[PDB]
Amino acid sequence: GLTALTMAEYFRDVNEQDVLLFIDNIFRFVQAGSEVSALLGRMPSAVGYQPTLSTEMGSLQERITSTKEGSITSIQAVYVPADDLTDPAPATTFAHLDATTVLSRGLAAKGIYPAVDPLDSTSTMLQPRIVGEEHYEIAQRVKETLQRYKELQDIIAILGLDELSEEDRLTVARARKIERFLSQPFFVAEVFTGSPGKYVGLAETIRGFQLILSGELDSLPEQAFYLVGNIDEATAKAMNLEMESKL
């Protein structure tokens, strides 16, 4: 971890460029710290990680800082043992993380690549003074819409899409539209499927989600938002489907 860290820190403080550290699951680094401390005989701490757990993991994850030269933002997988935020290693890690995005297995099996879960993922940056007031508003509204859909997934099995009220039938429709529009084709998936791959800026996805959730695009089909980039490209997909509808 520290080797990768200094190899990226040279990039940062010598080329003044944004560096990404994909440190693989931190719990292995803390595990190795526990291994080496138990080998050195230094008396173990709580559940069994090293006593210098906070100090060591902080020495690994404090050199991840945006210096005036350039940013060195990292992306660190974290593997909770026995699935608890309580024990020290995930505790001392989540004390440092600034954005936590979970990749969901059911969503991956569905094929909404990338499988990042829109609801359970959170970030400390999301607040309005950090993102922008409109970005915070549209993000909170999308999270509330996807909450509504996770709720009504229970009931659209029993009542159907028509029986329930048509003030939230719009919510379910725009929720399908958002859940599809979140799926983006990648510059890497070209080797597998053949889609070109679209990079979507923050402004473009903000305006696209504002148009989707505001109520203009309530007529475009649900599969026109799936695997598309900018929102105008989604309208292009829908217009091509309209062209082919006659044939």
């Binding site: 509504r148 009504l152 009931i155 029993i158 009542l159 029986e163 329930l164 009220s165 939230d168």
Partner: protein
């Protein structure tokens, strides 16, 4: 154990919602019959302006012996349902023991009648059961029983205890007087909230911003007065004499479907 219990109670919530919707679908199946019945009854009441010497099912001339018939829910854990129902039943039989009515009780719920068979201080006899759908044959059984009970005037002012479906969280138990039938068509209440028929209440369950709740539909069927000529086959009396039984049966089946 708690996780498996959570999965099981989520499954029971989903199954209970589907069962509520299928009972609503049975009620919407019945609404053609009820609308046609509540318009033909007015057609009779308009051809003859209650000019009648007939229908022993309209002997309200005293309150001598009431037959409060209490339908109840028949399963386990029964929400908070069966206790509320039989509580209102016990209050009403107490008030009918005040007046000295000698009330008999026709019970339609399995759990309710297994409760009633413990204490016979309440005179309870001839209890039946039908669940998961009120079948027209069980409705015919109850109709025949309480009908044969009313043709012998010993049974009069025959009210029923079915809980109308006002809301999903809690639906208060209400009590309707049944067997007089008010040949004008109004199946009215316990004297202070009597309602006119052809103004029905058909419950439609739909989601709110996010939840499941029942929204009432107080739809009004308009009754065609009469066909241009409207000849008449039977007597003026035997028509209502044979029609009020099936109206009694339709009200019993509705107060079984909505109770369920």
């Amino acid at each position: 154990s708690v996780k498996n219990t959570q999965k099981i109670t989520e499954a029971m919530k989903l199954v209970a919602a589907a069962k509520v919707r299928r009972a609503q679908e049975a009620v919407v199946n019945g609404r053609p019959f009820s609308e046609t019945l509540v318009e033909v009854l007015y057609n009779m009441n308009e051809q003859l302006q209650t000019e009648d010497v007939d229908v022993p099912l309209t002997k309200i001339r005293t309150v001598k012996k009431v037959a409060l018939m209490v339908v109840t829910g028949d399963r386990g854990l029964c929400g908070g349902f069966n206790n509320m129902l039989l509580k209102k039943a016990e209050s009403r039989i107490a008030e009918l023991k005040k007046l000295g009515v000698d009330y008999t009780i026709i019970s339609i719920g399995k759990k309710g009648n297994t409760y009633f068979i413990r204490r016979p201080e309440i005179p309870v006899d001839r209890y039946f059961d039908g669940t998961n759908l009120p079948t027209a044959k069980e409705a015919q059984a109850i109709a025949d029983d309480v009908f044969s009970l009313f043709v012998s005037e010993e049974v009069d002012k025959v009210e029923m205890l079915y809980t109308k479906f006002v809301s999903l969280v809690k639906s208060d138990p209400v009590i309707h007087t049944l067997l007089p039938l008010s040949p004008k068509g109004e199946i009215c209440d316990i004297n202070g909230k009597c309602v006119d028929a052809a103004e029905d209440e058909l419950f439609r369950l739909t989601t709110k911003e996010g939840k499941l709740t029942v929204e009432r539909d107080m739809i009004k069927t308009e009754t065609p007065a009469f066909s241009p000529i409207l000849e008449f086959e039977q007597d003026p009396a035997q028509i209502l004499d044979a029609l009020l039984p099936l109206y009694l049966n339709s009200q019993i089946l509705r107060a079984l479907q909505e109770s369920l």
